[PDB]
Amino acid sequence: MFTGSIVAIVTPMDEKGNVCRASLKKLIDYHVASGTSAIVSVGTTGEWATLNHDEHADVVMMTLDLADGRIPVIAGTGANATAEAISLTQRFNDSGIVGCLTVTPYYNRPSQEGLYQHFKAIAEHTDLPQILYNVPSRTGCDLLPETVGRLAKVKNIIGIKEATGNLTRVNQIKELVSDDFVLLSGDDASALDFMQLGGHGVISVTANVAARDMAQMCKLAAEGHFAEARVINQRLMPLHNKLFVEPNPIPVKWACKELGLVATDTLRLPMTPITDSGRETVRAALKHAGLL
Amino acid sequence: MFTGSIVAIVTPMDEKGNVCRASLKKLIDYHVASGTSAIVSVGTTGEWATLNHDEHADVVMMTLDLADGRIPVIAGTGANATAEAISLTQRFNDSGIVGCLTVTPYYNRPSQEGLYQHFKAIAEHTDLPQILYNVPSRTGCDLLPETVGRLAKVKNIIGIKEATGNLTRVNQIKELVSDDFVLLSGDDASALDFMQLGGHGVISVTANVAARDMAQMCKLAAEGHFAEARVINQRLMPLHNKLFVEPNPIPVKWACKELGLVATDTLRLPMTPITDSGRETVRAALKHAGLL
Amino acid sequence: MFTGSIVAIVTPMDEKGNVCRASLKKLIDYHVASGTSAIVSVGTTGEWATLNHDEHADVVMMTLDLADGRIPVIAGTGANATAEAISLTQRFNDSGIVGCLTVTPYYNRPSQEGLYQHFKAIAEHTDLPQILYNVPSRTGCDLLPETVGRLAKVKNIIGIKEATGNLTRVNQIKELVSDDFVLLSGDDASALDFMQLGGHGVISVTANVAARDMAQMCKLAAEGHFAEARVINQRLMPLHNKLFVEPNPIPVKWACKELGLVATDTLRLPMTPITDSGRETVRAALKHAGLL
Amino acid sequence: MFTGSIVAIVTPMDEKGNVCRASLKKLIDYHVASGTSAIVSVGTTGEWATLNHDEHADVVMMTLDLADGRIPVIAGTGANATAEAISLTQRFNDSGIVGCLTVTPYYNRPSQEGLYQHFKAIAEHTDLPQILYNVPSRTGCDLLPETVGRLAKVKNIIGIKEATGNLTRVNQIKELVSDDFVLLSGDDASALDFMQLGGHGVISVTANVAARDMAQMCKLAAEGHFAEARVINQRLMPLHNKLFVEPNPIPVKWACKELGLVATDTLRLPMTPITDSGRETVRAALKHAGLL
Ligand SMILES: [K+]
Ligand SMILES: [K+]
Ligand SMILES: [K+]
Ligand SMILES: [K+]
């Protein structure tokens, strides 16, 4: 469901840039075994931006097939044209995903009123639950609490991935929504803080390579054991930062390959292969988390 | 032609959101008559964000058909996947456009090296002149002068639309590139300053409703008559700011409707109709410019 | 001591700009009666910047005299020259204050190494406890966690007033310091959040006019009753924001006068009297907090 | 004289932090010989922050004594209390300085109206020309063009040192003030751009070690020979940036020592000695400029 440690899973690729089915299966089994609560398929970390709509759908369908009911699957579904968002979401009706992660229109910088209409329209054309995704550093566009409050009144809009790293948002949004609207961090480095303020979990990049620690950290948090949780957190903190030493998902894909979870660390342009210096930095962070 | 007042033309729509050929013809005749140097078809102001590839190609071909050789046309062609930019660009080879305006990958936040390989590859697969477009407020990524210097060495990368509003960039870029590389403002409120520092022109929103004044201002700036160009700029300055009182192209499409240049001011969601307050502000700016 | 609700008390003045002893007594009694834990005398809210050093000392001595052992007194003691900071601190040795609130040098923007030497030197020339005060929006200068960690190793440096409003700081600093280094918020609007993350109290502007609510909110927080605490918080939140609708301490002085706690709302230039529109805004916030 | 290359002169100190009269005389003779238009005594670069009022007056009187009528001297006189600025200013009336450089109140963050009443009052109580100084990175407050327009109507407020590095301000200010109001850059890296937009000169840090080049660059800019001025600016550009590799005036005092212009590079805490790495960077910048 929508709590605990949710992975924004990489889209592993062969040397040609196409999805690697064996690698994907290996990651999906690693999650099922690790206690991960759900998989976000073709989020930002899954290279949503460089997959075409059919390739995106293939990866989601494949991911659901390979999950085989053992672990719920959320699909990335954002578009910055409201009509395109509706169409793309319609594709996944009756597919088996439990929900959609739908990104704020990126680029065209709508007003808060436009954001409200965009998401309200998306929600009205599906029965799938919708998790709003706010990530202003990528989109140029900031979904404010007041607007999240308005959107939470729509039946199937059920939570938000808050990736600003701005922790005052947690309670500004909580005071405006019902007790079962979910609040998930999209910022690994502040996610334990976010849960300590009342957040319900995290859509994590770090969980790609430390799924068990991340799932244990979020059980502890949800139980009120923040000081036990922080010990795992300090173990992971260099990763939470150094998985962004170069643009995501360049580091986390390299790390997945170095840990043997995927066959190649290939990405699509304009993402570039990891630099030597980035490799050493990520290597050190992995050693610190006790994974090499 | 890649100097002077270049308009980033609105894509005029009927009440259903479909391109209105009659309104487009009127705009194009207006720019031919008013001395505009060229037309950017389906840029940001032309709602690039919300047109699919079919409509995008149609608008560009219709603009070329209506222009009928009387004014150069440049297409917006950016994409955040390098493969898709290359592919959209191929579709316009031998179309009759003189050039492409290609935006930095938005959303995925590539490194400078990524940006370099992106634009180099797009350029490698066409004969068309390419104009790089930097607009960090929309893309979350900033093409730096050093990278622009490296890209200018590629034969058909011929200029930049610099939309940061950061005037330091003009001479940082100019000292790294050859004398025939074109520097074009993409920020109307600072465009005269940009030209006085050595910029060659402006790709303008304001030009949609003040074509003649913009063309004369740019010609005066080109000859060095800055005090004279600034008289004109001071009467346009309220438009230069208030055409962004709500998200572009909401205000400018309203203005074009109020002047009678287009039949409706309809846009595509997530752009919303102009508010009553925006209407009052834009109307006062038009009156300050002497257009109403 | 250094926990709970600490007031950054206004320096009430007569129509001529000099300290008003009757008004000060009335505020000090109101605090003693309200449960306020301590008084910061001649902090930022007390107009430290527009009092000369003798006037500053007079206000501190007067405040301690009037407190008459009923409530501990911390003096503002910052200087941006390290020698001047030491001298100014020496004045208060053996005076009766329990500690100093010492601001980061403002203006000259030292390195982190310079900040470390400045504060280490101050601490070495007094036996008074020192609370570091980080407030980058006023000083242009940001004391980072790593540097706070180094400074906390000095015997008499015992806590920090963190006024950035950046809540990730609470745990970044906690993991680098011992369990009895104190962490106090300097940002009223985020202070309950700050305490919920592990902070020990707040040096508050809002407590000037809502001392009892603020003291009750921080007892509840310290006891783990965050949801009871939040109800008081939502009552006060318009105040926490609107006490800065004009520069502090302009609004809070007007509010103190409107509630009858001080005789005049006079301030020293370049602080100006409250605007009409600001008066109505602050009035509304007071009505909301149930104080008019 | 308030045009051309104006140096913000270092205050050279012996090993004990006391003003070194011999080093000061050498600097002053150097600026007379190198064509510098004037000297700003005890500005930011002159460690205004860390001198008390006694030392501040001494340095200014010693500079006037050594200059001996050969070059105009301007004093730094800002304060964040209006009463104290008025008072420091009175101390220099009939001293022989031609003007004051008065900084916006730092730290207390006054409103635009506050700033207006501040500078108007300072100006009302002197016959000396006043030059407003805007440096938001140090003061936390930004004097806006509209306020500058209002202040220019006061008879003896004659110009502004604009240190934001925001080049849009030049023509926003210039259109609101009369033709004899002086606009002076306070940001060396953007100063040539500032002049090309219509600025009249620069109050410069770089001028401390490259006097002659700075004076020639400013004269060429004044006559409109921008391409020629830019050759000089490109050789100074590493200094313009690297003299801030560590907090000003750490690097420039080191540079003056390495050139032999001052006996020691001692500063007052919280400024610290230059690091080994800063030394290497500044030395390479001096060699790029042709000074070593
Ligand atoms: K709902
Ligand atoms: K080229
Ligand atoms: K200590
Ligand atoms: K004047």
mmCIF file with all atom_site columns, C-alpha atoms in Angstrom, chain A residues 53 57 63 71 95 150 227 244:
data_model
loop_
_atom_site.group_PDB
_atom_site.id
_atom_site.type_symbol
_atom_site.label_atom_id
_atom_site.label_alt_id
_atom_site.label_comp_id
_atom_site.label_asym_id
_atom_site.label_entity_id
_atom_site.label_seq_id
_atom_site.pdbx_PDB_ins_code
_atom_site.Cartn_x
_atom_site.Cartn_y
_atom_site.Cartn_z
_atom_site.occupancy
_atom_site.B_iso_or_equiv
_atom_site.pdbx_formal_charge
_atom_site.auth_seq_id
_atom_site.auth_comp_id
_atom_site.auth_asym_id
_atom_site.auth_atom_id
_atom_site.pdbx_PDB_model_num
ATOM 1 C CA . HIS A 1 53  ? 4.902  6.318  -23.947 1.00 0.00 ? 53  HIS A CA 1
ATOM 2 C CA . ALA A 1 57  ? 3.838  1.186  -20.627 1.00 0.00 ? 57  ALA A CA 1
ATOM 3 C CA . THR A 1 63  ? 7.142  -4.866 -13.776 1.00 0.00 ? 63  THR A CA 1
ATOM 4 C CA . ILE A 1 71  ? 4.334  -6.347 -4.088  1.00 0.00 ? 71  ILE A CA 1
ATOM 5 C CA . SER A 1 95  ? -3.928 -2.933 -15.682 1.00 0.00 ? 95  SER A CA 1
ATOM 6 C CA . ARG A 1 150 ? -8.232 21.719 -2.259  1.00 0.00 ? 150 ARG A CA 1
ATOM 7 C CA . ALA A 1 227 ? 16.504 7.077  17.836  1.00 0.00 ? 227 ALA A CA 1
ATOM 8 C CA . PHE A 1 244 ? 23.078 12.708 -6.274  1.00 0.00 ? 244 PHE A CA 1
#
